[PDB]
Design a protein around this nucleic acid. Sequence first.
DNA 1: ATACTAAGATAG
Length: 380
Amino acid sequence: SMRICIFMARGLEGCGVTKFSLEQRDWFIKNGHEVTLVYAKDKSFTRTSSHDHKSFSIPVILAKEYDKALKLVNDCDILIINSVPATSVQEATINNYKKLLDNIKPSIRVVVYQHDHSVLSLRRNLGLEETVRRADVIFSHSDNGDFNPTVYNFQPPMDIVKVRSTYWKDVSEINMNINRWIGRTTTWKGFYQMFDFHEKFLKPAGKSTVMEGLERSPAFIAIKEKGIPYEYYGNREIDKMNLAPNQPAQILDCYINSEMLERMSKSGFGYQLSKLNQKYLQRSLEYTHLELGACGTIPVFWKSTGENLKFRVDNTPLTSHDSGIIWFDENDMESTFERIKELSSDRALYDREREKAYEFLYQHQDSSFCFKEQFDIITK
DNA sequence: ATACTAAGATAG
Ligand SMILES: O=c1ccn([C@@H]2O[C@H](COP(=O)(O)OP(=O)(O)O)[C@@H](O)[C@H]2O)c(=O)[nH]1
């Protein structure tokens, strides 16, 4: 047994790094370990309430509570750092952050996970080079990437088993006329391809489309400037949502993760159209990818992403397996629509497919396999 | 152009 301190020096953004952090805590605890979740409250974000953490996470203001922070990160056997201060923070914050790195007990094994898989990243990171100099172990999403002592690979795991046994519904309860897209307002999440698809196929067939997570950040202005039809709702107005036929895309903003899993488990189809560049592509799928195969719905993933990510077991393209995963192709959206109405009539098939994906995604990124993988390297 | 990005003010 050991004490682990998970540190998010950037703050709790409420996305994959926060998620990863929560799933990381769950696993250590599940394997009999003490975990303290600490985050720097200097900077504030929006999706702060998207994941449940308030009752156990420990905030700290680096620019003003250095000693509190020092006491915190030095009270453990293993320090895992998942994020670092952003470029928009004050000198005192980044500076005091760097001062923490220099005063971490020589005995504490410092493990650093580089969660950003974009060249654009690392630029929005401060004190990154000092974190790397003190790290005892480093993990990244890809070897053939921008980032590149010894850098190991990892996948952001999730307890897919748990999610199923909580939300997985009975086919007879899944409305085949609802298409749900989840992600956020950045172009590579594929929100345009989703708006198109609805306008060209989904809407016509009196089907419905929902898109959760599109925050009205500056990026949202492009959607407006292009005059794309949509009806906007907040989490408290999710009741006014019009799930009728031939309607425009219903857009929900920053959503609660638990609630989303519920609405999804009762949805004929779930869309995750992220299209990341193969440089930073190896084996890592994204949380929203694994949340679809787990809640019990047919997963529509971006075709070229599957063609670029390797399966954890054999190291081969994900698209070269019978996952029951519908690979969305921007250059053949009608064929993709085929495999959809198809499974949307023979609910018997739909259910023999959603079972195939869950097993596939389970074998690929469940915490049971991945964290054990990462734990062996940390303690190697 | 194209791809990626919560910037910033205010009410509660
Ligand atoms: O408004 C939102 C948007 C996303 N998420 C969750 O936050 C995580 C985001 O991680 P992912 O790897 O899917 O993408 P990222 O946002 O980190 O690029 C996923 O578990 C989503 O279900 C959420 O709870 N609310």
